[PDB]
Fold this sequence. Notes:
It is classed as sugar binding protein. The protein has 288 residues and is α/β, with parallel strands linked by helices.
Amino acid sequence: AAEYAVVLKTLSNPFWVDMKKGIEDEAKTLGVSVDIFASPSEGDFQSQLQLFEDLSNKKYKGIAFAPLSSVNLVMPVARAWQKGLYLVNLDEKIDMDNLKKAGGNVEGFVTTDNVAVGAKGADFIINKLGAEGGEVAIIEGKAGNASGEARRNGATEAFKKANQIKLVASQPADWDRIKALDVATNVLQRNPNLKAFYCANDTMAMGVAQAVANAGKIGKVLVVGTDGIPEARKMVEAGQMTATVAQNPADIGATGLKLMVDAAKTGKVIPLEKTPEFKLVDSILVTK
Ligand SMILES: OC[C@H]1O[C@@H](O)[C@H](O)[C@H](O)[C@@H]1O
């Protein structure tokens, strides 16, 4: 067992594959050993809990983690903090109110500005639709996930400021390709004048693009994703997706590791009452 553990969401999604490789590179750069785990699937709240708990029970100095939901890892993260492990939250913000109640904290949180991500996606759709504007929809991540909610809120508030836009639907598809395809299919059927989807990640954006194609509407309905996974960047380049707000999961991972290693060197965990370190990794809009 290595010095440090990492718990990621699922390597079924290239975003997490790239974060894993970023962390592995940074561990070599820093000269520290890392064990990296992930759940089979997005659905696996309980397994991810048991996985975290199994790690906390061994001899790791620190754990960096991206929880599947805001709440599923609260109790095991508290347990690790109590035991004196250096904890870093990656990407997906844990519920800090529930974590405090459980008697835990984290050294730091490393993420994208997910409000600005939503805003960039919406601002690009507003720019593309021009003065005519029209009806738009948001395809959300899992309800209550800080990542998704922030992108929903940034996009919504951007759309609201533009008179010529009407947000007709804003619905969860739980980071799932087929659920995103079903939701978008139904949004299209109910809203024959839809002009655009903003999608809180690329897994969902690719299902949305498939819904648009199925309805005969490629190019006529814009599709904007988030993450910049390889298949979405290809869809963008080929005009099957309009754009994606790329993230840098390698840098989120590498920055989170270094924050964990820097914290462990102080030889005391953050006090319950202290505000964690906060580091932002840039986003970039990818277009044709
Ligand atoms: O795992 C689903 C999604 O989780 C979010 O928190 C990440 O920032 C990525 O958008 C990822 O695709």
